[PDB]
Design a binder for this molecule. Sequence first.
Ligand SMILES: *[C@H](N[C@H](COP(=O)(O)O)Cc1c[nH]cn1)c1c(COP(=O)(O)O)cnc(C)c1O
Ligand SMILES: Cc1ncc(COP(=O)(O)O)c(CN[C@H](COP(=O)(O)O)Cc2c[nH]cn2)c1O
Ligand code: NA
Ligand code: NA
Lengths: 359, 360
Amino acid sequence: SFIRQHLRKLAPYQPILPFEVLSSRLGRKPEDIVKLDANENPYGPPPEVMEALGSIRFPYVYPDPESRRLRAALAQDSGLESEYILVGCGADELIDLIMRCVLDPGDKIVDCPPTFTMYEFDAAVNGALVIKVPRRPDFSLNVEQIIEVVKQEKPKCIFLTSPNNPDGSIIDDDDLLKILELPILVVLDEAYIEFSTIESKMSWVKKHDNLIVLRTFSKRAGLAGLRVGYGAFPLSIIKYLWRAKQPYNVSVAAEISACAALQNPTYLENVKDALVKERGRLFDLLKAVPFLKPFPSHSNFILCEVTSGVDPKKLKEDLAEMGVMIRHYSNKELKGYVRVSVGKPEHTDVLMNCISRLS
Amino acid sequence: DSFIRQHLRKLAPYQPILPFEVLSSRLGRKPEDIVKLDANENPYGPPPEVMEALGSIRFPYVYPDPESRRLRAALAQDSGLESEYILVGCGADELIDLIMRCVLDPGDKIVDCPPTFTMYEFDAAVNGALVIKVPRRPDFSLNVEQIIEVVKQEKPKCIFLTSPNNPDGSIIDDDDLLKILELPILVVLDEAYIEFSTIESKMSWVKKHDNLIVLRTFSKRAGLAGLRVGYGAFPLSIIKYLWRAKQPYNVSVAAEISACAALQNPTYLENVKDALVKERGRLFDLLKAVPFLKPFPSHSNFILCEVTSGVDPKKLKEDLAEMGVMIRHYSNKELKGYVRVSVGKPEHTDVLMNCISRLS
Ligand SMILES: *[C@H](N[C@H](COP(=O)(O)O)Cc1c[nH]cn1)c1c(COP(=O)(O)O)cnc(C)c1O
Ligand SMILES: Cc1ncc(COP(=O)(O)O)c(CN[C@H](COP(=O)(O)O)Cc2c[nH]cn2)c1O
Ligand code: NA
Ligand code: NA
């Protein structure tokens, strides 16, 4: 085989399926499926987006390789100069790009599960070796053990999600600053920060040349399908990433949609506020379910430990049969939980109705 | 001193081109007053079904199908090849890079046959592979006897072969391709421009050659370069592993929707292809009459010219840009002596020739 040896036993990522595919499999129209498994924004993007997408002037022309219009808009949005900002085909592209540019095969990376499964997946694809330092029972980082493995094994980078996926807890500044004192590249993933009251740390990259901060349009801004994310990078790192990055992965539709979304700050704030409001209602409803233990969250989702002998995978599959999709991941660190995205109030109501009829 | 991998600290960047909105600002001209013939884009745009579909996307806020299965079903119908052999990429660019990422360890070797598409050498450098060059012959044909000899000597993992080639447009004949396929190497045949030729696609060959991959795109004939959607035919023993290593969601909803829509209008696709083939012949004869340009025959939607008579090819390209016409010049050893002119509308050719006369 021509395939690289380390890929021959790669464990694949476990993606989820969209409405058009779910319809065929569940026997339901898309409008008759409640989809709470990928932290998507059920309100969709501001109306400016579909107006812009239906009037793209140059679909036949390659996109701007420098995404300079969006980066100017992001400099306005973030307060960080555009020289520090890269745009990616989702935050996913930037996670992978960082690893491709920093990790030689055999280099080590620290991961803190339970967390976003793409870090371990991307490390495996790139031939890096993962050092797992598990989070504490309250999902907080074990900084003492992070420091120890960093001293002992000299990993090159660590990814840290805040608000974390899948539980939604936030990393306190002092923990992050303690890790930034180490000779390691820290990538702070702020994919869900808009659902919190915490300020983005994008500006910190000007004071820490071993910090990257990642963001996305996929969740709050309702553009998951168009694939557009971004990040703040130290100038000493971004100069090399520019040279190694693929020229045209950010499509014209991605750039146009993100710029259009930013033109409606009132819509973006209102949908965010609606989702934050429903998060509290959903939490209280799930807490009353005898076999679910929800955790507090600053994101647009709620993690539930499944208790009382209930099979968490079967719970997820049973709800899917009933027309409601929630997230279950089959690996050792996550298989005991289910993760419920925050949707419209009527989506929560359907979910709780289905839960009440289980078994 | 730096977190960046050592081999990337010396990387030569790719030289991309700029879109109309950036050109307008840089040149001080409206886009309608800029003639853009530097990236093999289709000036007619995609079939009208595409902008209709893009304006009515139902679920922009939902992740796309990680398996792009609706488009792959349509591509199976279009190509006659079963969908299990077909991958969809964020442009053919994604598939070129994906192949290299899955097949080349650092230090592994790839054969390249310049002058050709510069992304092969760029992607090889980014992935830490070693490029083994077998230059094409003076008529741009492959040197099969040298490819055979170098494969035995260097034991490379793969070879990329463009047909119609970028930047000259010549085609690889079946016997040369078959001889190369007998070698212990992965052969990637890049058919990005095949629709502008009279040659049939070889996607079906991957069912009998498990060391052949065939790449295609919607960016050129189908007018979807900005939406980023390409595809390829892969042996089942290779595709199984590419599926596992591929990023889940790089093919956007807009990419899948636009490509499916384009395929609903075969008449439009044929008519714009025929208009571009017709203008290719007219453009060739006009360029041939320019004393300091030597155009080469082409089966694609572009014409390569050797710049002769002591004329600076880079300055020619930059002077034309100052007049509002963009053609391709690439600054590397094998390509710097040429300019490449994409085939546009007849009126685009006419502006180009006016500007050439004003330099001459
Ligand atoms: C968005 N993650 C989403 C949920 O994935 P999962 O936790 O259920 O496995 C969807 C996704 C996207 N790629 C893989 N899964 C996300 C991203 C990336 O979002 P974009 O690429 O769309 O910008 C990055 N970082 C985090 C923490 C999350 O949750
Ligand atoms: C032989 C060949 N195979 C694949 C692609 C990629 O097509 P996609 O499906 O990804 O759109 C191209 C496109 N080449 C264009 C001219 O590039 P140029 O020759 O350097 O001027 C534009 C481009 C895209 N990426 C870098 N350049 C090509 O010619
Ligand atoms: Na409970
Ligand atoms: Na001539």
